[PDB]
Amino acid sequence: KKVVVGTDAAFAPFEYMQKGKIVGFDVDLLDAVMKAAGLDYELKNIGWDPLFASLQSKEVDMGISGITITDERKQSYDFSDPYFEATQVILVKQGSPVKNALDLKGKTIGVQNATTGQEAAEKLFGKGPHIKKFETTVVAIMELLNGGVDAVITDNAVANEYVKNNPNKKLQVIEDPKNFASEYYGMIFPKNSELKAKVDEALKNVINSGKYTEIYKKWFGKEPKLDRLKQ
């Protein structure tokens, strides 16, 4: 019996489809972690909202989908030790007047459904019509390109990856460290999972052996500050 791992492979550089195969930082880290934990696994591309549903039903044993550790998600799920630090940013067209998150007032914001980016947008301007929720971040960014939304709030490394990969779209990343707090990714599990402890120990092995850093350098071209993982 293999471990069923779910991911939403529409979140580059962490997980995405390349020539019909699921690739990314989370994909490479998962492979490293699971082999260090001695667990045969299957990686499923399932979708963002199906994934969380599947984890609650326990049909999926494990998740790695650039998922931010939050106390709101700790209600139903368990998390591994953090393996990445992120923050929400604001993605816009280069000609945007947006300088900070407060400039987004009265404007339409495209977020992926049930994410920390949605939460951040709803924290500032409350729940309402000009917060447009999409199943993938890919589609949210697509509503930005065509003018359907004025701004996108998503994770920083994803936004930076899209700007880097797509210069002809002429998008810019607006950072607001005053409004957006530090976030940490964790591998997710159904409540009281027996895999969590094995994954935590395997992650340490992966970090200690220098395996994590090689994967980090591959996707981000620089040395990680590993002290971000002991916060």
Smallest distance from the beta carbon of 131 to ligand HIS, in angstroms? Answer: 15
The contact mask relative to ligand HIS for 139-158 (x = CB under 6 A, - = no) is ----------------x---
The residue range among 22-30, 61-69, 124-132, 139-147 that interacts with ligand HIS, by the rule CB under 6 A, is 61-69
How many residues bind ligand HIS, per CB under 6 A?
12
Question: Which of 33, 67, 90, 206 is in the footprint of ligand HIS by CB under 6 A?
Answer: 67
Smallest distance from the beta carbon of 1 to ligand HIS, in angstroms? Answer: 27
| Alpha helix stretches (DSSP H) within 4-153 | 25-37, 48-57, 116-125, 137-145
Tokens 């495209």, residue? 110
The residue range among 60-68, 144-152, 192-200, 209-217 that interacts with ligand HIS, by the rule CB under 6 A, is 60-68
The per-residue b/e assignment along 155-189, b for 16 or more CB within 10 angstroms, e otherwise, is bbbbbbbbbeeeeeeebebbbbeebbeebbbbbbb
Q: Strand 21-23 vs strand 84-86: parallel, antiparallel, or unpaired? A: unpaired
Do the beta carbons of residue 13 and residue 155 sit within 8 Å?
A: no
Closest-by-Cβ residue to ligand HIS is 115
- Considering beta carbons, is residue 80 or 112 the nearer one to ligand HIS? 112
What the block records as the tokens of 102 is: 């407060």
